[PDB]
Design a protein around this nucleic acid. Sequence first.
DNA 1: CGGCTGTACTG
DNA 2: GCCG
Length: 318
Amino acid sequence: NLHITEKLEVLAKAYSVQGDKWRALGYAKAINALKSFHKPVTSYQEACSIPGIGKRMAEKIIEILESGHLRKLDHISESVPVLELFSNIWGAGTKTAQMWYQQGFRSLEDIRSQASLTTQQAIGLKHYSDFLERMPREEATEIEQTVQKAAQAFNSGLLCVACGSYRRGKATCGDVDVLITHPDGRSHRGIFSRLLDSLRQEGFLTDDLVKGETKYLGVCRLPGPGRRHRRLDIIVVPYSEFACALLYFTGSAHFNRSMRALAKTKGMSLSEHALSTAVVRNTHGAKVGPGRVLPTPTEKDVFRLLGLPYREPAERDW
DNA sequence: CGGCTGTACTG
DNA sequence: GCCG
Ligand SMILES: [Mg+2]
Ligand code: NA
């Protein structure tokens, strides 16, 4: 199924970029369902059947089948392509894009010349094209290795794992996500600092976007002709959290959200730090009592404790 | 009626 | 947008 989704994707993005996040979530989930459906969809009654598809989406499917068109798609605001242009700048989202629009900016030349950018947005605009591009998974390999090689030059016992789409076995990667830990659980942050320093000194790191104590995002470029600037995310964790970190950083993101949402129905909470149980939540679903951390030395343990069958990373790409 | 994941960083 |  891609006949009807292609038309939905355009509404999903229109909604997302105008900041209607939940309606856009509705569309996103429906789109997902339709894609993992075996056969093409035939009846409005078959429509409702599919979890993630209700009356409103059913009617729209019907129109796509009956008319081969979507009336809502010709009513999309003329501002949408511009809002998408703007929020493809790293560091600029829905609010900033809509503000810029209101203020009369219609193009990246307008932003470049007339807009006051944060440090992150200026780096984002500089790399606008490169950030929209995916790298072959083989290039990800060279980057993980460059990072790993450099880390292991401080403390050779450090473990570096490439995560995200790479670990899920995808042929291309939007960025490289490197997870760093140490088996003693005591080795952190003296490294993470100096590590970035050498990588920056080797000329490998071109720009910094986020520098936190355990988390880094920046821009690197491998040496040589024909190389593009790439996004590189690095996080350091204590060995205690290694498995929950690995699970999180590997994703996919829709998978993390599904997992976490299930954990919530079981009175549990899952995050990059821990899976914990006996979590106390107020009526709005917000966490109040922290509950207690459940032991989780491997990804297997996390699935198990949730009552789920183990998925290897490739089966996580939702 | 109202949640839809949970966390971190920046200014 | 969908659903419990
Ligand atoms: Mg990634
Ligand atoms: Na952005």
